[PDB]
């Protein structure tokens, strides 16, 4: 955590609903955006830390 | 804590529609069954 690793996400699509539809993840949270809305959205970049 | 609001509903209210229901709201891939994962109690307190 003192050396956190960042992917930069661009020029692509993904099913962001899988992040909470899959039981593989013990918690999911969202801020500004709503978790059910994510598949309708578009962005210039996303940073995956 | 005696002041509260509805955090979740299936759809938006019509004008002057009123709704006191406390049933557990389900978002997706797991049912509520009176509980959680993808399921939520529909009210919250302000707790002033």
Swiss-Prot record, chain A:
Query: Outcome of mutating residue 22 to L, per the record?
Result: In strain: Omicron/BA.1
Assembly: Binds to host ACE2. RBD also interacts with the N-linked glycan on 'Asn-90' of ACE2. Cleavage of S generates a polybasic C-terminal sequence on S1 that binds to host Neuropilin-1 (NRP1) and Neuropilin-2 (NRP2) receptors. Interacts with host integrin alpha-5/beta-1 (ITGA5:ITGB1) and with ACE2 in complex with integrin alpha-5/beta-1 (ITGA5:ITGB1). May interact via cytoplasmic c-terminus with M protein. May interact (via N-terminus) with host bilirubin and biliverdin, thereby preventing antibody binding to the SARS-CoV-2 spike NTD via an allosteric mechanism.
Q: What does this protein do?
A: Attaches the virion to the cell membrane by interacting with host receptor, initiating the infection. The major receptor is host ACE2. When S2/S2' has been cleaved, binding to the receptor triggers direct fusion at the cell membrane. When S2/S2' has not been cleaved, binding to the receptor results in internalization of the virus by endocytosis using host TFRC and GRM2 and leading to fusion of the virion membrane with the host endosomal membrane. Alternatively, may use NRP1/NRP2 and integrin as entry receptors.
Please give the name of this protein: Spike protein S1
Instruction: Report the portion of the entire protein shown.
Output: 350 to 398 of 1273
